[PDB]
Structure formats: C-alpha cells, structure tokens
Amino acid sequence: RPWQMKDLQAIKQEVSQAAPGSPQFMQTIRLAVQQFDPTAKDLQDLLQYLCSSLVASLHHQQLDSLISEAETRGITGYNPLAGPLRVQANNPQQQGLRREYQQLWLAAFAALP
C-alpha cells in the first residue's frame, strides 16, 4: 500500500510555504513516514519531489553521518555481511532496519536549520 500521486501532491502543497525542518514540515513528514511505512527507495523519491538538489545533498550528508554512527555502534537487526543499511531497509523482512532508516531520515532532515 505505497502512497499514490495524490498523497504526495497533498504533502507537498500543505507545506509549500514552510521551510525544511520547520515544526510544521516535521509534523507532516513524520506523519507521512509513520503512516505509509515506506522503504529507503520511496523516501528518496519523496525527498527528490520535495526539496531541491542542494537540500537533497545536505540531507544526504547528514544522514550518511547519522547512519554511520548508528550502525558503527552496532544495531540489533543489522548484519554488515549482507549489504548497506540502504539495501537491508529495502527488504520487506527487515522491518527493524526500515524503522531505524525512517527515524535517521527524519532526524537528519530536521537537523538542517
């Protein structure tokens, strides 16, 4: 049950005025992420739709650092012999990795301003 075009259009329109990482944007994006239960691929699509290449790159770097610390510590469900967290989160049998990816994503995007 992935999102459709209308959901993305509403998500972008409702937060057109606000700035990335504002409390309003964080509210709406967090609700979307917690409601649709998407993988990393869909999150990348959503970010490309919402913010430009500059904000995309900044979030990419911040999320790289956050994932770096998180999975360098060691995580309950992460096994580094199978692939990067971006790929484990895309397997529907690793929901723990998917939820960790979602939370790192939202925190990284909130850490912009």
TrEMBL record:
It is found in: Virion. One of its GO terms (biological process) is viral process. One of its GO terms (cellular component) is viral capsid. Coiled coil: none annotated. One of its GO terms (molecular function) is zinc ion binding. Keywords: Capsid protein, Metal-binding, Virion, Zinc, Zinc-finger. This is Gag protein. It comes from Human T-cell leukemia virus type I. The lineage of its organism: Viruses, Riboviria, Pararnavirae, Artverviricota, Revtraviricetes. The chain holds residues 40 to 152 of 326 of the full protein.
